Amino acid sequence: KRPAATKKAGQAKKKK
Amino acid sequence: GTVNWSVEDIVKGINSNNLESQLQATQAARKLLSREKQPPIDNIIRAGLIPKFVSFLGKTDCSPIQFESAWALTNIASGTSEQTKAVVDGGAIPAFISLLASPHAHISEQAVWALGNIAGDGSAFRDLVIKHGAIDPLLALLAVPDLSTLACGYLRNLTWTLSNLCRNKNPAPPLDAVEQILPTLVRLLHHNDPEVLADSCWAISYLTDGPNERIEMVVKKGVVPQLVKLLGATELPIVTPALRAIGNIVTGTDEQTQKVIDAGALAVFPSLLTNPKTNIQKEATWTMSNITAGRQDQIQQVVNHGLVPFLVGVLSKADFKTQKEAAWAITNYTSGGTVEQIVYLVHCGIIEPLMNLLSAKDTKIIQVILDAISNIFQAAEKLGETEKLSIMIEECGGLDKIEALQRHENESVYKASLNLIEKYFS
């Protein structure tokens, strides 16, 4: 019946 | 040779009329942007070099400068939304899309990595990348008989970039883009590389985070079983995203939920609900609450797997957040469960650990619990048993916390508690 946010997911961007 | 150049120099070279001077200068700029020591992205952006780089992307005749600028642009796009904005404003999106077809695997890989950073910024750029039509060129790069033949790292970048084309919501990725991508995504959720597997699950977890129609187009591809399997993986980096996808799928219709139950999901929870990593627990318990909120035959499945004892355990000792999800699981269960089942729950020792939680400073949970109580009492009065239930709650000091809550500040709280007392106590 109910969903929430996240334990940060997302390494949206990656360097080099 | 091209190490430690000053932005001043890098400019001098890129502005010279010598292709080599420029390539040398671009390699130099690339290296600057490839250090962990807070790289000069803003200075480079300030020098006004992006439109220059973006231009070097088209130097088909000089692959190295394509690569060098591609890599440079990539790290700038890896920065803040503003830094990424700079790249996009420079006309790079269509340019990088052109490089996907580059005969140099190392250059198109950079194009994949760059479009990855851009789309990762959010909905807008995600959909802009999509409008320039990057999906076909991308998907085309995975059009081989056996994925194992592709470069291990090349395949991970593609999987990651597709992952971002699925990422974000408000708005959610375009439907036809998701349908177009799903087929390929499913083939990736079957690859042997643990990293491809993790990003694949993240991709599916994203797609399953939204309206039931969304969860459906994913479930409709029959990936659930493959997920339940990945849910038993050893590598946490795979299990985390896999549990997240399953967790989302059960927030949909009971038919979709049933899919994971059939898939074998439930059998992996005794482990997930006692997992050392709190978040795996937090998410496993949350997942359980969305299953206990379904059908009674589905509540039975949970019972038959002996997960009630596990919930009792989580409700007893765990991270608070995990215990709140447990509170819900228990509250949802007592919400739609049969009397016989709500009986089992208490025979498992749900009452005591439940009362003790009526001590936490979280008005919401105190609600959910009391809520579950009346539920239980209700099924009790159908067996006249009520008094026993009373005794019981009084035995473990629950009555004290309830008759105490009766004098709480939240209007609803003291109200539900006060009623419990009169209608069932002292």
Side-chain angles (χ1 to χ4, degrees), chain B residues 284-336:
Chain B
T285 302
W286 159 67
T287 297
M288 286 307 283
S289 75
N290 288 317
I291 295 169
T292 59
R295 316 189 206 119
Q296 307 194 313
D297 54 295
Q298 299 194 307
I299 282 186
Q300 257 299 129
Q301 293 277 57
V302 170
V303 161
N304 284 156
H305 278 78
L307 300 184
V308 166
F310 279 101
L311 293 169
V312 165
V314 144
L315 198 64
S316 303
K317 153 180 268 279
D319 180 71
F320 184 63
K321 298 185 178 182
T322 305
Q323 297 182 297
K324 208 149 115 66
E325 283 303 345
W328 280 104
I330 308 305
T331 213
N332 287 336
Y333 176 116
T334 63
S335 183

Coordinates of all heavy atoms in Angstrom, one line a residue, chain B residues 284-336:
Chain B
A284 N 13.7 -5.2 3.0 CA 13.1 -6.5 3.0 C 11.8 -6.5 3.8 O 10.8 -7.2 3.5 CB 14.0 -7.6 3.5
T285 N 11.8 -5.8 4.9 CA 10.7 -5.7 5.8 C 9.6 -4.8 5.1 O 8.4 -5.2 5.2 CB 11.1 -5.0 7.2 OG1 12.1 -5.8 7.7 CG2 9.9 -5.0 8.1
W286 N 10.0 -3.8 4.5 CA 9.1 -2.9 3.7 C 8.4 -3.8 2.7 O 7.2 -3.7 2.5 CB 9.8 -1.8 3.1 CG 9.2 -1.1 1.9 CD1 8.0 -0.3 1.9 CD2 9.6 -1.1 0.5 NE1 7.8 0.2 0.7 CE2 8.7 -0.3 -0.2 CE3 10.7 -1.7 -0.1 CZ2 8.9 -0.1 -1.6 CZ3 10.9 -1.5 -1.5 CH2 10.0 -0.7 -2.2
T287 N 9.2 -4.6 2.0 CA 8.6 -5.5 1.0 C 7.6 -6.4 1.6 O 6.5 -6.7 1.1 CB 9.8 -6.3 0.3 OG1 10.7 -5.4 -0.3 CG2 9.2 -7.3 -0.7
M288 N 7.9 -6.9 2.8 CA 7.0 -7.8 3.5 C 5.7 -7.1 3.8 O 4.6 -7.7 3.7 CB 7.7 -8.3 4.8 CG 8.7 -9.4 4.5 SD 8.0 -10.7 3.5 CE 7.1 -11.6 4.7
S289 N 5.7 -5.9 4.2 CA 4.5 -5.1 4.6 C 3.6 -4.9 3.4 O 2.4 -4.8 3.5 CB 4.9 -3.7 5.1 OG 5.3 -2.8 4.0
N290 N 4.2 -4.8 2.2 CA 3.4 -4.7 1.0 C 2.8 -6.0 0.5 O 2.0 -6.1 -0.4 CB 4.2 -4.1 -0.2 CG 4.5 -2.7 0.0 OD1 3.7 -1.9 0.4 ND2 5.8 -2.3 -0.3
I291 N 3.3 -7.1 1.2 CA 2.8 -8.4 0.8 C 1.7 -8.8 1.8 O 0.7 -9.5 1.5 CB 3.9 -9.5 0.8 CG1 4.9 -9.2 -0.3 CG2 3.3 -10.8 0.6 CD1 6.1 -10.0 -0.1
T292 N 1.9 -8.3 3.0 CA 0.9 -8.6 4.1 C -0.3 -7.6 3.9 O -1.3 -7.7 4.6 CB 1.4 -8.3 5.5 OG1 1.9 -7.0 5.7 CG2 2.6 -9.3 5.8
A293 N -0.2 -6.7 2.9 CA -1.3 -5.8 2.6 C -2.1 -6.3 1.5 O -3.1 -5.6 1.0 CB -0.8 -4.5 2.3
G294 N -1.8 -7.5 1.0 CA -2.5 -8.1 -0.1 C -3.6 -9.1 0.2 O -4.3 -8.9 1.2
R295 N -3.8 -10.1 -0.6 CA -4.8 -11.1 -0.3 C -4.5 -12.0 0.9 O -3.4 -12.1 1.3 CB -5.0 -12.0 -1.5 CG -5.0 -11.4 -2.9 CD -5.4 -12.4 -3.9 NE -4.9 -12.2 -5.2 CZ -4.1 -13.0 -5.9 NH1 -3.7 -14.1 -5.3 NH2 -3.7 -12.7 -7.1
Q296 N -5.6 -12.6 1.4 CA -5.4 -13.5 2.5 C -4.7 -14.8 2.2 O -4.0 -15.4 3.0 CB -6.8 -13.9 3.1 CG -7.7 -12.7 3.4 CD -8.9 -13.1 4.2 OE1 -9.5 -14.1 3.9 NE2 -9.1 -12.3 5.3
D297 N -4.8 -15.2 0.9 CA -4.2 -16.4 0.4 C -2.7 -16.0 0.2 O -1.8 -16.9 0.3 CB -4.8 -16.8 -0.9 CG -4.8 -15.8 -2.0 OD1 -5.5 -14.7 -1.8 OD2 -4.1 -15.9 -3.0
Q298 N -2.4 -14.7 0.0 CA -1.1 -14.2 -0.1 C -0.6 -14.0 1.3 O 0.7 -14.1 1.5 CB -1.1 -12.9 -0.9 CG -1.7 -13.1 -2.3 CD -1.4 -11.9 -3.2 OE1 -1.7 -10.8 -2.9 NE2 -0.8 -12.2 -4.4
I299 N -1.4 -13.7 2.2 CA -1.0 -13.6 3.6 C -0.6 -15.0 4.1 O 0.3 -15.2 4.9 CB -2.1 -13.0 4.6 CG1 -2.2 -11.5 4.4 CG2 -1.8 -13.3 6.0 CD1 -3.2 -10.8 5.4
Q300 N -1.4 -16.0 3.6 CA -1.1 -17.3 3.9 C 0.3 -17.8 3.5 O 1.0 -18.5 4.2 CB -2.1 -18.2 3.3 CG -3.2 -18.7 4.2 CD -2.6 -19.5 5.4 OE1 -2.9 -19.3 6.6 NE2 -1.8 -20.5 5.0
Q301 N 0.6 -17.4 2.3 CA 1.9 -17.7 1.7 C 3.0 -17.2 2.6 O 4.1 -17.9 2.8 CB 2.1 -17.0 0.3 CG 1.1 -17.6 -0.7 CD 1.7 -18.8 -1.4 OE1 2.0 -19.8 -0.7 NE2 1.8 -18.8 -2.7
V302 N 2.8 -16.1 3.2 CA 3.8 -15.5 4.1 C 3.8 -16.3 5.4 O 4.9 -16.6 5.9 CB 3.4 -14.0 4.5 CG1 4.3 -13.5 5.6 CG2 3.5 -13.1 3.3
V303 N 2.6 -16.8 5.8 CA 2.6 -17.6 7.0 C 3.2 -19.0 6.8 O 4.0 -19.4 7.6 CB 1.1 -17.8 7.4 CG1 1.0 -19.0 8.3 CG2 0.6 -16.6 8.1
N304 N 2.9 -19.6 5.7 CA 3.4 -20.9 5.3 C 4.9 -21.0 5.2 O 5.5 -22.1 5.3 CB 2.8 -21.4 4.0 CG 1.4 -21.9 4.2 OD1 0.6 -21.9 3.3 ND2 1.1 -22.3 5.4
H305 N 5.6 -19.8 4.9 CA 7.0 -19.8 4.8 C 7.7 -19.5 6.1 O 8.9 -19.5 6.2 CB 7.4 -18.7 3.8 CG 7.3 -19.1 2.4 ND1 6.1 -19.2 1.7 CD2 8.3 -19.5 1.5 CE1 6.3 -19.6 0.5 NE2 7.6 -19.8 0.3
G306 N 6.9 -19.4 7.2 CA 7.4 -19.2 8.5 C 8.1 -17.9 8.6 O 9.1 -17.7 9.3
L307 N 7.5 -16.9 7.9 CA 8.1 -15.5 8.0 C 7.5 -14.7 9.1 O 8.0 -13.7 9.5 CB 7.9 -14.8 6.6 CG 8.5 -15.5 5.4 CD1 8.3 -14.6 4.2 CD2 10.0 -15.8 5.6
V308 N 6.4 -15.2 9.6 CA 5.7 -14.4 10.7 C 6.7 -14.3 11.9 O 6.9 -13.3 12.5 CB 4.4 -15.1 11.2 CG1 4.0 -14.5 12.5 CG2 3.3 -14.8 10.2
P309 N 7.4 -15.5 12.2 CA 8.4 -15.4 13.3 C 9.5 -14.4 13.0 O 10.0 -13.8 13.9 CB 8.9 -16.9 13.3 CG 7.7 -17.6 13.0 CD 7.1 -16.8 11.8
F310 N 9.9 -14.3 11.7 CA 10.9 -13.4 11.3 C 10.4 -12.0 11.5 O 11.2 -11.1 11.9 CB 11.3 -13.6 9.8 CG 12.2 -14.8 9.7 CD1 11.8 -16.0 9.2 CD2 13.5 -14.6 10.0 CE1 12.6 -17.1 9.2 CE2 14.4 -15.7 10.0 CZ 14.0 -16.9 9.6
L311 N 9.2 -11.7 11.2 CA 8.7 -10.4 11.4 C 8.7 -10.1 12.9 O 9.0 -9.0 13.4 CB 7.2 -10.3 10.9 CG 7.1 -10.4 9.4 CD1 5.6 -10.5 9.0 CD2 7.7 -9.2 8.7
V312 N 8.3 -11.1 13.7 CA 8.3 -10.9 15.2 C 9.7 -10.6 15.6 O 9.9 -9.6 16.4 CB 7.9 -12.3 15.8 CG1 8.2 -12.2 17.3 CG2 6.4 -12.5 15.7
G313 N 10.7 -11.2 15.0 CA 12.1 -11.0 15.3 C 12.5 -9.5 15.0 O 13.1 -8.8 15.8
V314 N 12.1 -9.1 13.8 CA 12.4 -7.7 13.3 C 11.7 -6.7 14.2 O 12.2 -5.7 14.6 CB 12.1 -7.5 11.8 CG1 11.6 -6.1 11.6 CG2 13.3 -7.8 11.0
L315 N 10.5 -7.1 14.6 CA 9.7 -6.2 15.4 C 10.3 -6.0 16.8 O 10.1 -5.1 17.5 CB 8.3 -6.7 15.5 CG 7.3 -5.6 16.0 CD1 7.2 -4.5 15.0 CD2 5.9 -6.3 16.2
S316 N 11.1 -7.1 17.2 CA 11.7 -7.1 18.5 C 13.0 -6.4 18.7 O 13.1 -5.5 19.6 CB 11.9 -8.6 18.9 OG 10.7 -9.3 18.9
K317 N 13.9 -6.7 17.8 CA 15.2 -6.0 17.8 C 15.7 -5.8 16.4 O 15.8 -6.7 15.6 CB 16.3 -6.9 18.5 CG 17.7 -6.7 18.0 CD 18.7 -7.6 18.7 CE 19.3 -7.0 20.0 NZ 20.4 -6.0 19.7
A318 N 15.9 -4.5 16.1 CA 16.3 -4.1 14.8 C 16.5 -2.6 14.8 O 16.3 -1.9 15.8 CB 15.3 -4.5 13.7
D319 N 16.9 -2.1 13.6 CA 17.1 -0.6 13.4 C 15.6 -0.1 13.6 O 14.7 -0.8 13.3 CB 17.5 -0.3 12.0 CG 17.7 1.1 11.8 OD1 18.7 1.7 12.4 OD2 16.9 1.7 11.1
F320 N 15.5 1.2 14.1 CA 14.2 1.7 14.3 C 13.4 1.7 13.0 O 12.2 1.2 13.0 CB 14.1 3.1 14.9 CG 12.7 3.6 15.2 CD1 11.9 2.9 16.1 CD2 12.2 4.6 14.4 CE1 10.6 3.3 16.3 CE2 10.8 5.0 14.6 CZ 10.1 4.4 15.6
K321 N 14.0 2.2 11.9 CA 13.3 2.3 10.6 C 12.9 0.9 10.2 O 11.8 0.8 9.5 CB 14.3 2.9 9.6 CG 14.6 4.3 10.0 CD 15.5 5.0 8.9 CE 15.8 6.5 9.3 NZ 16.5 7.2 8.3
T322 N 13.6 -0.1 10.5 CA 13.3 -1.5 10.1 C 12.0 -1.9 10.9 O 11.1 -2.6 10.4 CB 14.4 -2.5 10.4 OG1 15.6 -2.1 9.7 CG2 14.0 -3.9 9.8
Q323 N 12.0 -1.5 12.1 CA 10.9 -1.8 13.1 C 9.6 -1.1 12.7 O 8.6 -1.6 13.1 CB 11.3 -1.5 14.5 CG 12.5 -2.2 15.0 CD 12.8 -1.8 16.4 OE1 13.1 -0.7 16.7 NE2 12.7 -2.8 17.3
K324 N 9.8 0.0 12.1 CA 8.6 0.8 11.7 C 7.9 0.1 10.5 O 6.7 0.0 10.4 CB 9.0 2.2 11.3 CG 7.9 3.3 11.5 CD 8.5 4.7 11.8 CE 8.3 5.7 10.7 NZ 6.8 6.1 10.6
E325 N 8.8 -0.5 9.6 CA 8.3 -1.2 8.4 C 7.7 -2.5 9.0 O 6.7 -3.0 8.4 CB 9.5 -1.6 7.5 CG 9.9 -0.4 6.6 CD 8.8 0.2 5.8 OE1 7.8 -0.4 5.6 OE2 9.0 1.3 5.2
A326 N 8.2 -3.0 10.0 CA 7.7 -4.2 10.6 C 6.3 -3.9 11.2 O 5.4 -4.6 11.0 CB 8.6 -4.7 11.7
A327 N 6.3 -2.7 11.9 CA 5.0 -2.3 12.4 C 4.0 -2.3 11.4 O 2.9 -2.8 11.6 CB 5.2 -0.9 13.0
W328 N 4.3 -1.8 10.2 CA 3.4 -1.8 9.1 C 3.0 -3.2 8.6 O 1.8 -3.5 8.5 CB 3.9 -1.0 7.9 CG 3.8 0.5 8.0 CD1 4.8 1.4 8.3 CD2 2.6 1.3 7.8 NE1 4.3 2.7 8.3 CE2 3.0 2.6 8.1 CE3 1.3 1.0 7.5 CZ2 2.0 3.7 8.0 CZ3 0.4 2.0 7.4 CH2 0.7 3.3 7.7
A329 N 4.0 -4.0 8.4 CA 3.8 -5.4 7.9 C 2.7 -6.0 8.8 O 1.7 -6.5 8.4 CB 5.1 -6.2 8.0
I330 N 3.0 -5.9 10.1 CA 2.1 -6.5 11.1 C 0.7 -5.8 11.1 O -0.4 -6.4 11.2 CB 2.7 -6.3 12.6 CG1 4.1 -6.8 12.6 CG2 1.8 -7.1 13.6 CD1 4.2 -8.3 12.1
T331 N 0.7 -4.5 11.0 CA -0.6 -3.7 10.9 C -1.4 -4.0 9.6 O -2.6 -4.2 9.7 CB -0.3 -2.2 11.0 OG1 -1.4 -1.6 11.7 CG2 -0.2 -1.6 9.6
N332 N -0.7 -4.2 8.5 CA -1.4 -4.5 7.3 C -1.9 -5.9 7.3 O -3.0 -6.2 6.9 CB -0.4 -4.5 6.1 CG 0.0 -3.1 5.7 OD1 -0.7 -2.1 5.9 ND2 1.1 -2.9 5.0
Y333 N -1.1 -6.8 7.9 CA -1.5 -8.2 8.1 C -2.8 -8.3 8.9 O -3.8 -8.8 8.4 CB -0.4 -9.0 8.7 CG -0.6 -10.4 9.1 CD1 0.2 -11.4 8.5 CD2 -1.5 -10.8 10.1 CE1 0.1 -12.8 8.9 CE2 -1.7 -12.1 10.5 CZ -0.9 -13.1 9.9 OH -1.0 -14.4 10.2
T334 N -2.8 -7.7 10.1 CA -4.0 -7.7 11.0 C -5.1 -7.0 10.3 O -6.2 -7.0 10.8 CB -3.7 -7.1 12.3 OG1 -3.4 -5.7 12.2 CG2 -2.6 -7.8 13.1
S335 N -4.8 -6.3 9.2 CA -5.8 -5.5 8.6 C -6.7 -6.3 7.6 O -7.9 -6.2 7.7 CB -5.1 -4.4 7.7 OG -6.1 -3.6 7.1
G336 N -6.1 -7.2 6.9 CA -6.8 -8.0 5.9 C -6.8 -9.5 6.2 O -7.3 -10.3 5.4

